[PDB]
Tab-separated table of C-alpha atoms and ligand atoms in Angstrom:
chain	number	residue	atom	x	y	z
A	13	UNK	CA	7.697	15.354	8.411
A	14	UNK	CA	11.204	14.748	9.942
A	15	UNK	CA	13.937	14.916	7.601
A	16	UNK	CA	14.756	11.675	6.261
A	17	UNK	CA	18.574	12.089	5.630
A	18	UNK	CA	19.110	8.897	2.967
A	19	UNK	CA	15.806	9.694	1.368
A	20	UNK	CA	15.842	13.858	0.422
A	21	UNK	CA	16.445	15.030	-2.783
A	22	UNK	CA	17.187	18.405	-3.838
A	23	UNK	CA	14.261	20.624	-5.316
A	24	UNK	CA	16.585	22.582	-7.290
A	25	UNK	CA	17.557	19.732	-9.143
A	26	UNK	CA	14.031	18.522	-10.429
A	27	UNK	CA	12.546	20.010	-12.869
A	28	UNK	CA	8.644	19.042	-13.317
A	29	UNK	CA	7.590	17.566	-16.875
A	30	UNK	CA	4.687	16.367	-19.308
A	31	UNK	CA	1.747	15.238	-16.932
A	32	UNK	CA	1.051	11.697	-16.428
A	33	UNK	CA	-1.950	11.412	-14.714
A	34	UNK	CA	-4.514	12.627	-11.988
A	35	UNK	CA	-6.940	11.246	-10.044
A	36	UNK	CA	-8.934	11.645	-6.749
A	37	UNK	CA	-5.791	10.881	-4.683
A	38	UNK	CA	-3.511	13.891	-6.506
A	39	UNK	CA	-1.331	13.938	-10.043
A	40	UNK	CA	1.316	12.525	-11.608
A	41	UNK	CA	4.182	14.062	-13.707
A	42	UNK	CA	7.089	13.118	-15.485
A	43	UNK	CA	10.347	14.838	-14.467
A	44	UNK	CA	13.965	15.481	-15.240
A	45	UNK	CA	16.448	14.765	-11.820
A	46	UNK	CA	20.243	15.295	-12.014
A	47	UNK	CA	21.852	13.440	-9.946
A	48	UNK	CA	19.173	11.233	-8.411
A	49	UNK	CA	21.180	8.634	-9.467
A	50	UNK	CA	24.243	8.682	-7.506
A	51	UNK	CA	26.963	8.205	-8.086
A	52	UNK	CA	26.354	9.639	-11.429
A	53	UNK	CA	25.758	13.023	-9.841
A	54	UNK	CA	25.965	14.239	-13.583
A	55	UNK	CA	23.594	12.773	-15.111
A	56	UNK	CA	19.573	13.557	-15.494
A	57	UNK	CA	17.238	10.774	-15.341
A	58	UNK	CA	13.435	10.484	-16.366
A	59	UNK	CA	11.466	9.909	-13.299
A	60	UNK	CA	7.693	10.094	-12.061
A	61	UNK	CA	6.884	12.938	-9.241
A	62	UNK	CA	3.651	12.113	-7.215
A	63	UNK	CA	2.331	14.953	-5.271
A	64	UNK	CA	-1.071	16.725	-4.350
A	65	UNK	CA	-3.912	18.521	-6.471
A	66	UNK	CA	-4.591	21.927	-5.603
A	67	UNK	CA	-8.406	20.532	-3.891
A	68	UNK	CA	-5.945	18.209	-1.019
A	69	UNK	CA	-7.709	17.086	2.144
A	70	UNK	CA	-5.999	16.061	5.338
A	71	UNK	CA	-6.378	12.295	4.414
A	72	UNK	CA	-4.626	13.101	0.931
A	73	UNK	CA	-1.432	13.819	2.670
A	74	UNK	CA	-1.425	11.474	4.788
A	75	UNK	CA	-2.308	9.162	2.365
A	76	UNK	CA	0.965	10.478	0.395
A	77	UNK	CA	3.233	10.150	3.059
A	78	UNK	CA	1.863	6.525	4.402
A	79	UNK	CA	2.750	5.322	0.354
A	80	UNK	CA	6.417	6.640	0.473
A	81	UNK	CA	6.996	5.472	4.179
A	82	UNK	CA	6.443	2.167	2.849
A	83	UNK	CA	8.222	2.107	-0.292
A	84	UNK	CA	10.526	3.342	1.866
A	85	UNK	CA	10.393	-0.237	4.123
A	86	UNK	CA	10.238	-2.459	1.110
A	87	UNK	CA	13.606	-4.203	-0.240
A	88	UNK	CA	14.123	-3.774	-4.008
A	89	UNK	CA	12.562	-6.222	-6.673
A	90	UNK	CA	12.779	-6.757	-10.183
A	91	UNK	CA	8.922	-6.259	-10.082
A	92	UNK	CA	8.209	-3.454	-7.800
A	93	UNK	CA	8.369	0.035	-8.875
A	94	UNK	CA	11.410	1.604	-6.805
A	95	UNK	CA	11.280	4.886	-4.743
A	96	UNK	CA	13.912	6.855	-5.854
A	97	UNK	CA	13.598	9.754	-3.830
A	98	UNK	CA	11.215	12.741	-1.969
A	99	UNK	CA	11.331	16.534	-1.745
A	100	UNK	CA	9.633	17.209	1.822
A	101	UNK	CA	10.888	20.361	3.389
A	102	UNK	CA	10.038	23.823	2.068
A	103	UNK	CA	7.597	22.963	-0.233
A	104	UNK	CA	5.143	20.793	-1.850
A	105	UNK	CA	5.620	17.017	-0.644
A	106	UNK	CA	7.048	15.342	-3.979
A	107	UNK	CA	7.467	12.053	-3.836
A	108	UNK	CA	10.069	10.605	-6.955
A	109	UNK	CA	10.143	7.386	-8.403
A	110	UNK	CA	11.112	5.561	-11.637
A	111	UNK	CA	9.800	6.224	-14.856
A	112	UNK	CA	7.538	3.299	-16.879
A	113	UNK	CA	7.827	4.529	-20.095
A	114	UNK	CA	4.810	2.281	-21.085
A	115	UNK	CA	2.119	3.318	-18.274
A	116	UNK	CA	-0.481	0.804	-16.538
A	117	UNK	CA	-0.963	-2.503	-17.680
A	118	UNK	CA	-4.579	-2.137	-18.271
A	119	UNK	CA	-3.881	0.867	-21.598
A	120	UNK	CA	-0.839	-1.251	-22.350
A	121	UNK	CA	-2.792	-4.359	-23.023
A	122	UNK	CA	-6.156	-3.103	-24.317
A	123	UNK	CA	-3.238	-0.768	-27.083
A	124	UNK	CA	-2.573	-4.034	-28.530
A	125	UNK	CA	-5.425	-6.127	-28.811
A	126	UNK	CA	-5.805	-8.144	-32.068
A	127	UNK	CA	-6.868	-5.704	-35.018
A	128	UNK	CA	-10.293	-6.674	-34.723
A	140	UNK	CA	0.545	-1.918	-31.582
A	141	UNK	CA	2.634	-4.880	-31.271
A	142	UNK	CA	-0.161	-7.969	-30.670
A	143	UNK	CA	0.041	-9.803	-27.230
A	144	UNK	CA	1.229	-13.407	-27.485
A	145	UNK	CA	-0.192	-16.146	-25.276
A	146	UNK	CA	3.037	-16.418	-23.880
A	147	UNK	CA	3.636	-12.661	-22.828
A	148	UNK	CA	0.631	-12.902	-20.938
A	149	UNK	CA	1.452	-16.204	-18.967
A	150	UNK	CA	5.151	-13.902	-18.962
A	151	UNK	CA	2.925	-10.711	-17.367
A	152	UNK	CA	1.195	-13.280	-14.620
A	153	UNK	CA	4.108	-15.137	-13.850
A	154	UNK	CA	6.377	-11.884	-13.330
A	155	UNK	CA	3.406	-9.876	-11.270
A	156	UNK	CA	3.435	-13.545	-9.401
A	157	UNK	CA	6.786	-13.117	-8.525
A	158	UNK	CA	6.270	-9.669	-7.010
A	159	UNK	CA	3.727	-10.656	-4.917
A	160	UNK	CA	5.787	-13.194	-3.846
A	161	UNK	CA	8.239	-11.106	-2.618
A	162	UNK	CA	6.005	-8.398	-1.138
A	163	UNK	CA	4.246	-11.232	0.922
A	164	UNK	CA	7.630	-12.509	2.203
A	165	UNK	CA	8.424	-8.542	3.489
A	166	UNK	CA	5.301	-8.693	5.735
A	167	UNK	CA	3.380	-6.076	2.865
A	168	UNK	CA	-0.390	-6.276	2.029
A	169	UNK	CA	-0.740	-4.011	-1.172
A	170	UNK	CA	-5.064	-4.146	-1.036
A	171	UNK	CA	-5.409	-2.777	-4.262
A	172	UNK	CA	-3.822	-5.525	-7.132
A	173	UNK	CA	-5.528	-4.117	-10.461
A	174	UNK	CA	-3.863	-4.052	-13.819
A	175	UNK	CA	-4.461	0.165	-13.448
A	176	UNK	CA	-2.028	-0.015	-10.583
A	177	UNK	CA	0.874	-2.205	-12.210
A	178	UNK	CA	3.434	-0.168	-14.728
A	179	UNK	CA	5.746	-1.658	-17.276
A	180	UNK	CA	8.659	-0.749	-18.543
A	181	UNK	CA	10.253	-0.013	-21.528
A	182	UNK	CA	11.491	-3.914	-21.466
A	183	UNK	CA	8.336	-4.690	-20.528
A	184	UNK	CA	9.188	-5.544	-16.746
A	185	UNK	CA	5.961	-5.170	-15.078
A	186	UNK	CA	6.036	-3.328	-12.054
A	187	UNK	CA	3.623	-3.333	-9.002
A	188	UNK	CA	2.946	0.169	-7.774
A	189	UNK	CA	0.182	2.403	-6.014
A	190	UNK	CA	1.313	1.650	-2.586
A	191	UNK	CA	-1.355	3.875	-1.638
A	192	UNK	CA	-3.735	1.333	0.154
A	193	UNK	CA	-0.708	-1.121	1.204
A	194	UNK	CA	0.047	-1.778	4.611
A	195	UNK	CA	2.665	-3.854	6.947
A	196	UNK	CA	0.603	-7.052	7.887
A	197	UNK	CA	0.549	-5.968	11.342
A	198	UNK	CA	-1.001	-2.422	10.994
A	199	UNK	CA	-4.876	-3.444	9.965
A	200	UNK	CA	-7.337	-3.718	12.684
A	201	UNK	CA	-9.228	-6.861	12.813
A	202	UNK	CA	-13.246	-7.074	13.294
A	203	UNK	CA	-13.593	-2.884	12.775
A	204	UNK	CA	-16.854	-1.888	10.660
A	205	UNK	CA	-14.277	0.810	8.942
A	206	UNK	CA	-11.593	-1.975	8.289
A	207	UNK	CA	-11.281	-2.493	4.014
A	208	UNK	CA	-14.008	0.514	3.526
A	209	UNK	CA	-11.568	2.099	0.636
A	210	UNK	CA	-11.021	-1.106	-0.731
A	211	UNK	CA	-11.929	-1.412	-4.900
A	212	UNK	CA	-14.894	-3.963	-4.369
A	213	UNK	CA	-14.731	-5.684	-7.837
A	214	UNK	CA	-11.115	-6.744	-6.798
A	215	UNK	CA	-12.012	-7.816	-3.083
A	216	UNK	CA	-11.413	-10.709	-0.916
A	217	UNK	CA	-14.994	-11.329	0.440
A	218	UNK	CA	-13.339	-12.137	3.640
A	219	UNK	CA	-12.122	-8.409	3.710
A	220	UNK	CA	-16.097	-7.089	3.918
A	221	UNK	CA	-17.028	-10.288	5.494
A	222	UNK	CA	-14.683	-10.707	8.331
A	223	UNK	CA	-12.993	-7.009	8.504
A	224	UNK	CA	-8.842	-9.181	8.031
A	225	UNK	CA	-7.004	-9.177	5.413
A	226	UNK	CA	-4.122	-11.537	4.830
A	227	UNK	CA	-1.690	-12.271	2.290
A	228	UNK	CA	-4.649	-14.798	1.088
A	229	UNK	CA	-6.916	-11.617	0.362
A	230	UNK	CA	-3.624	-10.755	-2.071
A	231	UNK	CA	-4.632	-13.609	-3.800
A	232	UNK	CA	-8.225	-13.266	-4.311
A	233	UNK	CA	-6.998	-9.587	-5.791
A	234	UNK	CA	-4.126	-11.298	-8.230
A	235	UNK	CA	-6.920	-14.107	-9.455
A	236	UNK	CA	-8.900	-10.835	-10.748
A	237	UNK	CA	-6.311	-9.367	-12.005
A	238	UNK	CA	-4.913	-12.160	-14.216
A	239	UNK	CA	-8.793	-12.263	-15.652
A	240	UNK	CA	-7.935	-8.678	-16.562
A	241	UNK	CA	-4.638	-9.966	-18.687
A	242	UNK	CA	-6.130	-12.709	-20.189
A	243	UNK	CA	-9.045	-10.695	-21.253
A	244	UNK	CA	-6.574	-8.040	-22.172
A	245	UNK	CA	-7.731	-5.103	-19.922
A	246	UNK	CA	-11.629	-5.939	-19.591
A	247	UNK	CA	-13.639	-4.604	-16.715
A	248	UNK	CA	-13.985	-7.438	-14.298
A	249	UNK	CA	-17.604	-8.650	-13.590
A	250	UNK	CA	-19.079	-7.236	-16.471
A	251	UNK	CA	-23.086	-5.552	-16.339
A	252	UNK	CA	-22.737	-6.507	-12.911
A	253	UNK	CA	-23.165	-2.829	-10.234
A	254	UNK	CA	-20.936	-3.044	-7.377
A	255	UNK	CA	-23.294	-3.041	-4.882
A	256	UNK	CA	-24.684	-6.678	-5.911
A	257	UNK	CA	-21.409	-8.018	-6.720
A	258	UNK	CA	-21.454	-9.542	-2.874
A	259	UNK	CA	-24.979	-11.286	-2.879
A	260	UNK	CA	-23.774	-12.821	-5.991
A	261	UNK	CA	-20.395	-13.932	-5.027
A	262	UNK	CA	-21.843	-15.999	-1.902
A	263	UNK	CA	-24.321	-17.233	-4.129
A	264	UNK	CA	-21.106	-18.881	-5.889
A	265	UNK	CA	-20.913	-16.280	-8.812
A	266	UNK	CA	-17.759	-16.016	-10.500
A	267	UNK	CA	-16.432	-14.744	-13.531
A	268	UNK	CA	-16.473	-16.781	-16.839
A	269	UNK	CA	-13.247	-18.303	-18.717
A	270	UNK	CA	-11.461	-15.258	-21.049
A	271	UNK	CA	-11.453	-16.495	-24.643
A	272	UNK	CA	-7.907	-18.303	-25.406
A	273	UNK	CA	-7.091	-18.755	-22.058
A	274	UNK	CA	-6.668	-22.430	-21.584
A	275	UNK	CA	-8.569	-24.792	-18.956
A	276	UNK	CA	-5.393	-24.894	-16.677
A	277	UNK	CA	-5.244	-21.278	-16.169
A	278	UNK	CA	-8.584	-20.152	-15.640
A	279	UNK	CA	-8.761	-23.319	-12.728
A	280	UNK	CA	-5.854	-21.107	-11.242
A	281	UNK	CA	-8.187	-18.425	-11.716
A	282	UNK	CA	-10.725	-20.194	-10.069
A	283	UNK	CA	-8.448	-21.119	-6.918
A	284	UNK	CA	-7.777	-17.998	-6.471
A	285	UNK	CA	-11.422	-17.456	-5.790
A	286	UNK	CA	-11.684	-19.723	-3.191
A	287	UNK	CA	-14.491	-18.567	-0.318
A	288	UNK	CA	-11.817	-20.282	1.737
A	289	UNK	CA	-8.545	-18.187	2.156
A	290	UNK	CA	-6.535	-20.803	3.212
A	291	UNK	CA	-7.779	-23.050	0.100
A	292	UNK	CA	-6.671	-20.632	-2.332
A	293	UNK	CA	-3.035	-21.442	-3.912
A	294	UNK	CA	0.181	-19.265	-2.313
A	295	UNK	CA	2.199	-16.766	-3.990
A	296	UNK	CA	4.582	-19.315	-3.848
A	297	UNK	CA	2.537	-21.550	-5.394
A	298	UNK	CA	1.382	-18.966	-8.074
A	299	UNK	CA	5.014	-18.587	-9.595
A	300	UNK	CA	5.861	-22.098	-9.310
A	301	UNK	CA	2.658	-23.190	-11.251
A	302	UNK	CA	3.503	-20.074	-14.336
A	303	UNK	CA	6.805	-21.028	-14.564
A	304	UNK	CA	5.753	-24.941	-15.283
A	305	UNK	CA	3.150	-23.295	-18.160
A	306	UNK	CA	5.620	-20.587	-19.383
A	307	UNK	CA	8.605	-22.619	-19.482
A	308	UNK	CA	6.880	-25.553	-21.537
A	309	UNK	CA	4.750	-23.316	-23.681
A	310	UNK	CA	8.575	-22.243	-24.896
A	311	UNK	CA	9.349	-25.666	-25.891
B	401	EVC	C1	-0.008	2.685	-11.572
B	401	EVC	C2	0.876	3.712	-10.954
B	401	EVC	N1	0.071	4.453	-9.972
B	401	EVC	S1	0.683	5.995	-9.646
B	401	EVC	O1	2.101	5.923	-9.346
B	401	EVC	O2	-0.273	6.591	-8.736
B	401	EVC	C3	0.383	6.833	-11.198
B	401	EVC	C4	-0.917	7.237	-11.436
B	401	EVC	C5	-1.208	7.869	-12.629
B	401	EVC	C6	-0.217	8.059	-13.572
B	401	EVC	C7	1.069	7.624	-13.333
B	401	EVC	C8	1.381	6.999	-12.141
B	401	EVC	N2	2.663	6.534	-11.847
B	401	EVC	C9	3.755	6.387	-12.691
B	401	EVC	N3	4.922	6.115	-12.113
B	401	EVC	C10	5.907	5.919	-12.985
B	401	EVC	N4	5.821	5.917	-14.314
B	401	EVC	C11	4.620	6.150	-14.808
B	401	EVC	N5	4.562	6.188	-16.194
B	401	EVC	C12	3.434	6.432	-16.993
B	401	EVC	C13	2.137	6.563	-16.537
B	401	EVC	C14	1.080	6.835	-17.390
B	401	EVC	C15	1.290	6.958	-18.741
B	401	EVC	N6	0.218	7.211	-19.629
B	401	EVC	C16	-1.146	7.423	-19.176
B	401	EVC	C17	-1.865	8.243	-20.235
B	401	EVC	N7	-2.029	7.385	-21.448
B	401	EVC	C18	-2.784	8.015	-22.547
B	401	EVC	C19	-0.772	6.661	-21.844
B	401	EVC	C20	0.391	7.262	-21.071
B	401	EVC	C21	2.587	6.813	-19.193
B	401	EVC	O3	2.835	6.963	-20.545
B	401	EVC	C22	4.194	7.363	-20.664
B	401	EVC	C23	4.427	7.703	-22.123
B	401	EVC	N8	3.983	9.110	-22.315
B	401	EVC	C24	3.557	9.400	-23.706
B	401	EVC	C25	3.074	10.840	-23.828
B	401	EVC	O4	3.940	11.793	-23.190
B	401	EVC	C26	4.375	11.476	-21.861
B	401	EVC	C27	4.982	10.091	-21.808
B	401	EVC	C28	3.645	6.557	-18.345
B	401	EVC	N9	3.572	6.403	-14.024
């Protein structure tokens, strides 16, 4: 790893927290940093610390380091967790970002359900689309292909700002090699473009396919997506014309959004663009 001058931050002035989470990919932890936030160089803020398990493989690290390089390359947004900083010479690989003091958007939602712990109003989830919308928006328009849009891998705040994170899979639309059997092989399959199996692309269209899934996750507040249904039939059914059914109390007008976003046809699915224009219409006259 060459030294990335803007980028390092000092070990000595981390110190390693409450764990967060771990998966197959490594573990999270919460973390104290002084002086992260220059020019406060005083001050200690909260932050998250991503970094291997003991069991790593070659691909882990990789993995690791392809994630911060592009947070890295990534302007900041309202509605993309920021990288704050990495500790990558003598020592672990750490890599530091903000704090989301209320975890992934599938706990937070499914933690306030109705009673049969603050209840979700219709409009905070139109609120949740239209800002995760937004984000994609702007990730699109910096050349980025995330590939793995779940409600797992977006964080909120303690505002509740939602925040799209897991760069893991993501990738500059540029660096994905068209037509290759191994092309999309790590890709979640109940939150797939068909076209990304199909065809072996992926486009800022396949981006959609993955946001229409994951607004049936808000609007069912955190349900698993194709429900009884084993990912290895999910395909057959899908060309057959399958798709998922409306959520309760969602109205007509946003499941058809939905519904375009599950266009076979990439190009006949609705834009980001089009995404946040169409929420803001519903959000701003569900208000009034
Ligand atoms: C999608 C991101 N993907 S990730 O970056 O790979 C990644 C993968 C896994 C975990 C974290 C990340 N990332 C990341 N980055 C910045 N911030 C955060 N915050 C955050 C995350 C989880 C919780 N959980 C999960 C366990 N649940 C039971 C609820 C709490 C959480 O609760 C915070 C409140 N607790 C209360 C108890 O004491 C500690 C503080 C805050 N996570």
């Amino acid at each position: 790893l060459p030294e990335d001058p803007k980028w390092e931050f000092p070990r000595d002035k981390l110190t390693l927290g409450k764990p967060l989470g771990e998966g197959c990919f490594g573990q999270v932890v919460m973390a104290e940093a002084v002086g992260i936030d220059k020019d406060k160089p005083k001050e200690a803020v909260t932050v998250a610390v991503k970094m291997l398990k003991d069991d790593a493989t070659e691909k882990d690290l990789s993995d690791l380091v392809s994630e911060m390089e592009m947070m890295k390359m990534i302007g900041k947004h309202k509605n993309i967790i920021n990288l704050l900083g990495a500790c990558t010479q003598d020592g672990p690989l750490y890599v530091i970002v903000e704090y989301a003091s209320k975890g992934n958007l599938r706990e937070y939602l499914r933690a306030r359900r109705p009673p049969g712990e603050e209840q979700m109003t219709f409009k905070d989830l139109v609120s949740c689309t239209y800002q995760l919308a937004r984000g994609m928006e702007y990730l699109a328009s910096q050349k980025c292909i995330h590939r793995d849009l779940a409600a797992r891998n977006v964080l909120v705040t303690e505002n509740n700002v939602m925040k799209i994170a897991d760069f893991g899979l993501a990738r500059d639309i540029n660096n994905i090699d068209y037509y290759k059997k191994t092309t999309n092989g790590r890709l979640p399959v109940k939150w797939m473009a068909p076209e990304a199996l199909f065809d072996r692309v992926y486009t800022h269209q396949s981006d959609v396919w993955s946001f229409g899934v994951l607004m049936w996750e808000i609007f069912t507040l955190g349900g698993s997506p194709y429900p009884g249904i084993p990912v290895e039939e999910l395909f057959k059914l899908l060309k057959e014309g399958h798709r998922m059914d409306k959520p309760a109390n969602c109205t007509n007008e946003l499941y058809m959004m939905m519904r375009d976003c599950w266009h076979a046809v990439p190009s006949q699915r609705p834009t980001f663009k089009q995404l946040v224009e169409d929420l803001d219409r519903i959000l701003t006259l569900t208000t009034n």
